Nucleic acid binder design. Sequence first.
RNA 1: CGCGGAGCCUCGGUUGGCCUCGGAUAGCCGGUCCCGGGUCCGGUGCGGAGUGCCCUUCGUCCUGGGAAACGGGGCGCGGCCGGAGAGGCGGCCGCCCCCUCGCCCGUCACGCACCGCACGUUCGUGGGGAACCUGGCGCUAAACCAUUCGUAGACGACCUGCU
Lengths: 99, 190, 99, 201, 109, 139
Amino acid sequence: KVACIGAWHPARVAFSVARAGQKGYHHRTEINKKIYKIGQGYLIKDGKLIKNNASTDYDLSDKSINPLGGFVHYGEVTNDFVMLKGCVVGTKKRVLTLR
Amino acid sequence: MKTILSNQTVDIPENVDITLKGRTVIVKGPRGTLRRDFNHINVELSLLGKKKKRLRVDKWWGNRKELATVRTICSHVQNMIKGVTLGFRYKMRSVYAHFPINVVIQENGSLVEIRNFLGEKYIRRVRMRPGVACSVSQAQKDELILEGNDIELVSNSAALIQQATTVKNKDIRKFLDGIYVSEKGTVQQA
Amino acid sequence: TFKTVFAEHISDECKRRFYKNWHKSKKKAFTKYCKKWQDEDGKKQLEKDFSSMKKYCQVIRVIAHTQMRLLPLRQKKAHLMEIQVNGGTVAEKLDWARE
Amino acid sequence: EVQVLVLDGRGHLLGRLAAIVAKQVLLGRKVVVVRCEGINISGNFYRNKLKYLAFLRKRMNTNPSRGPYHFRAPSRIFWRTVRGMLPHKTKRGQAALDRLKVFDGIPPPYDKKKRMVVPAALKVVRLKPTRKFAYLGRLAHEVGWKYQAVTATLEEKRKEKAKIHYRKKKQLMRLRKQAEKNVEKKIDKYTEVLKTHGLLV
Amino acid sequence: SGRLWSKAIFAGYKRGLRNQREHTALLKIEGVYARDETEFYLGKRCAYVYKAKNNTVTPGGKPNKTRVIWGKVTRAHGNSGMVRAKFRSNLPAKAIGHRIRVMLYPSRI
Amino acid sequence: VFRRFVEVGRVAYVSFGPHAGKLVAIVDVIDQNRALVDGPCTQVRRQAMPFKCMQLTDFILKFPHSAHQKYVRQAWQKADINTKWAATRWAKKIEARERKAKMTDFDRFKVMKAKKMRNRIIKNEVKKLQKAALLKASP
RNA sequence: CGCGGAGCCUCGGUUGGCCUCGGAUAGCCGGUCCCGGGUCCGGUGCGGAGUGCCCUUCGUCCUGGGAAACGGGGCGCGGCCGGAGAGGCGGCCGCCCCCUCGCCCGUCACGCACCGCACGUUCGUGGGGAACCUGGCGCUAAACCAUUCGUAGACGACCUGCU
Ligand SMILES: [Mg+2]
Ligand SMILES: [Mg+2]
Ligand SMILES: [Mg+2]
């Protein structure tokens, strides 16, 4: 708890004192997230699909951005993707607005 | 006490032909033209002559404070007339004890930049007023030579580049460095 | 907001956004609207609504939507968004958006 | 008298115009005040800005969302001065205060109507010319009014449509004067009756 | 044809600051704003014409739903127009800021 | 600016006060506010008047300051001020302004019919003058 | 879409309009000749004036003279154009269609002339609500609950899915 929620006078609780209530699910805008990669989706090219959008020029493996077993609580990413540095708001499957 | 009448007349040479659009003095001479409005002062301006063209200015029931603005108008008009026939010229020396202040003039005399003031790395860049052209002299080793028509723009441009070279956090009874206005002259010395 | 113009063929994943219950509806949204792209008296209404929007508006915003059938999610209802168009004059950014 | 009263706000002192408006609104009399950026306040600018910034500090510190509502447009600063001259806690003063419409700039119901001027509230009448004054449009800009640039671009657009109106109205005035010389042998009888009884000097 | 009465505003009752006397009304006649300009009006009949829900009788016609409270202008009030008026029954406070007719009956012109 | 000056001999027009509507002449000046003032031919005996009552005209008489009554009377009579006034437009505007006020109910009727006819001809004529200015067919 | 009709219910105010320069104030306004200017000419206790201007309403019939004749009138049709700050408005044309009347000054007589007496005169086909007849032209939905979801959750709310 918060032990004191205000003095005697003003004879009211001010708006600045910590109170209990809703946590999370608030709209937030955070800035200066750097893009690290704009990834290409699975495209079917010569009859069989090219799936190497997590390859680098140092790795050269034929692997997708999907971890083994897929992204947890999400699914798999077959479309174009953006790789941002760090953490962003929301759960998995949250629609993000990126401007 | 409010004085019934306080006038002061200004002689105008034959080079300049000033006009009066109300309380706006448009002076026009060989070095260009100038313009100020005096519509923050309640006076009457009138051209007098037909051959010599004086300029009077009257106040009509002024108190003491209003009676001071008459001769200021006359002094501003006379600095317009000196500005469009002779023009204004400020020579300012660069004083330094150890680190030579390097001034190089940027685009067509509109911007100066000052490199080595007290031996430091930040580069002062101070823009002149519109109409003031700065220059580096050839008569002496290090003086700026900036010049123009209007006195309140030539003088402001010297004040910007003098307050740009302020010594901070030191005693300024030693450390006398900076660029300081050395004389207030004219072009076309009569 | 001055004037809004929609396209002729809006897909069902975007038309699903306009309903609270897709399953009980008769799917009638933008059906009287789309006929004025194949009309003449309603056709001439459209380019008057572009040219007035060309001569009054200062801000243009395109109305775009995602396409949820490429995503592995349960949701089929797409998300609409106004994305504004920077750069150029208003007449320049308008016929860009019509293409 | 059922029409509204359209007052130009420009050149008028704030509280001299407000006592004029507040007495009319209590006597019936719908009144519209347009162009509230032109309203002047006497005393130099910095002095009057401090009185608004001193007002911006009065807020209920327990919950300032309940507090004094500090309106920042020039039309809504003027609207609170005339409210302070009204008995606005009663039904009579609340029914007064909605006979008053205030506007920034001149909106398109009132741009094609001729404005009135109250001479007992003008700056050129009520101040000595060597006294400093301020503008309500400038002072609202430094306290947080978002829109003096867009309101200035719409006032300069209104005026150039209004110059075209004037020089066409004035073009008909010299055709009417041209007509009075064409027809003067057939209206000399009627211009004698009007000149006898005090019309037509 | 024509208006034939002069239009006036019901301003308020004869009052002090913290007392009002409802038996005397205060009127502002449009057009007169000085006390020397108000001697014309000092005996004139005056009416407060209003409408209500039920029909009442009309002298000289079928039952309308207009009703009248009649009064007289008795004296001047102040230095700028503003006569005061005595009505047969006191004016309702609903009427404050509405129209009162001033009539040109009993004449002295 | 400032064509009309308070000086000795300046003829003023009294705008309000008890002597309202009378021409009068400035004889001497007192203390920035008042003026010694005399109308010998307009029934205003010599007295003091504030300058805010009086409105300056264009007429100046020639007599020295604080002369007696007879020297401002005869300066009034030659270069006759009473007949130069009531020939200016400003005395004509006053003459028209009061005869509009002393206009009876029947004279307002005769003016109403006359002005209604007079504006029919003028309005008819400007229809013709602006449709003849409309007959223009040049690039 | 009609005023198309018939009646109602209910809320009342109101008693002719002004359709627009921008501004200056120790200065303004209006015309004009030469390249929006300079000249020039006027006005300025603003008369090209809000201390103003415009509309004016007894109705008709006899009958003349002026103004007119390039006109008037149509919720006449058809087209065009202007206006976005709250456009909610304002124009210009083409064809039809009736009227030579309406505006001033006159002849000529007439209308409940209701017998001294109040709420008369407008806006106004006002607003609002129901019901009816008459025509045309049209139109055929969602929302909530239940259900499912878990990006949500104390409960409601929110996010979802269902030939
Ligand atoms: Mg130290
Ligand atoms: Mg804020
Ligand atoms: Mg009524």
